[PDB]
């Protein structure tokens, strides 16, 4: 059978993830992209404006700039990119979300964080 | 004889610091510990009855960027985050 | 104009693969998700009115080396594993 | 007091038994061990606890066996420390004491190595 590299671990005890609020009316399913170096669990709001494609977020003591990719012609097409959730048949075990009409679920949004221009 | 495996906790509990001998700590000394930020990697392997399907995260992405799959609330203007590994993957027949 | 973050999940829950534009993966496939195997490095910080106490993990036992702390009862014969970083530490006045 | 830039702070301690420790019964051990050894695999540890040198199997690999404090070198530990977390806020640690008030010590320290080999 498969085998993983030999320096690597089974992900046991995946968290939870709420799959049932997917297909909900007011509810989008969002990707960010942001830099490694900030603290998100020190954050308590995010000053992304939805309506913007660009703008500059100021998160603690830094600035940075915000672009909505999906508002991009080259963020246009996001079908490349599933959501693999855990299974209640198979422990440990991932599978692909799906909608209620067995459609494959995908973002909504997209947004790069990234810091502004610097000579370190 | 066997020693028995009972528990195995890979999580921080306790901390082995290393002084001098003969070390004298006051009881009442208080202590914390700090983790500096390191970033997993990921392998994915899949299977379906037909095809095989095998990715990777990219070593140095996982050093620059950390990625958040977002639970958008449209009316509450709320959102629940949830970081996540990108693995770009590979589909390959049996 | 600001998003409330209601919930932020550190550890691993979701995964974003991404394969090629359009791909249909069937909805019985099943996927298994694997982790590098890491050691984490840390900082120790103590305090008191009359000490402050300071240490770190050397990176390369951290590389090398893991170690555990261990509770073993002579009569059942069975063990409990705590992971734990060993920190050489210093001691200054304050 | 400010940790290094990319530092942050263990605020979810996982418990630890320290009542367990006091009784004549339980015996504390540090074990060093190779990084490449998935310990969560394992179902036992077929050390043997009266041999200072020995060997043991893992996986399908062959390790040397170094009980520490069997040999002058690791009879002495008072130089290391254990800091357990308080279970009032386990976000703080302390150092473990028995009813003598004198700092907790290792009983055992045992060292599993990898064999000579010739990369």
């Known amino acids: 059978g ?3 590299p030999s320096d690597y671990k089974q992900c046991k005890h995946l968290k939870s993830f709420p799959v049932s609020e997917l297909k909900g009316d007011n509810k989008e399913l969002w990707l ?3 830099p490694a170096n900030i603290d998100i669990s020190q954050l308590k709001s995010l000053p992304l404006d ?11 003591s830094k600035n940075f700039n915000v672009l909505q990719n999906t508002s991009t012609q080259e963020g246009s097409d996001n079908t490349n990119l599933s959501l693999l959730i855990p299974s209640e048949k198979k422990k440990e075990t991932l599978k692909v979300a799906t909608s209620k009409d067995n459609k494959s679920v995908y973002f909504d949004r ?3 964080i990234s810091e502004t221009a610097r000579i370190p | 004889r066997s020693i028995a495996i009972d528990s195995y906790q890979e999580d921080p509990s306790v901390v082995v610091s290393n002084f001098f001998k003969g070390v004298r700590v006051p009881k009442d000394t208080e202590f914390q510990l700090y983790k500096k930020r390191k ?6 392997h899949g299977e379906n009855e037909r095809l095989e399907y095998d990715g990777e995260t990219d070593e140095l992405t996982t050093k620059t960027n950390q990625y958040m ?4 609330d ?6 629940n985050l949830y ?3 990108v693995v770009t993957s590979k589909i390959v027949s049996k």
């Open chain 1, 2 to 4: 498969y085998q993983p």
């Open chain 1, 32 to 34: 960010m992209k942001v």
């Open chain 1, 50 to 60: 939805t309506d913007a494609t660009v703008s500059t977020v100021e998160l603690g």
């Open chain 1, 110 to 112: 997209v947004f790069t």
């Open chain 2, 39 to 44: 970033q997993d990697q990921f392998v994915l």
């Open chain 2, 69 to 72: 799959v977002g639970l958008y």
């Open chain 2, 74 to 79: 449209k009316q509450s203007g709320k959102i």
């Open chain 2, 83 to 85: 970081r996540a590994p």
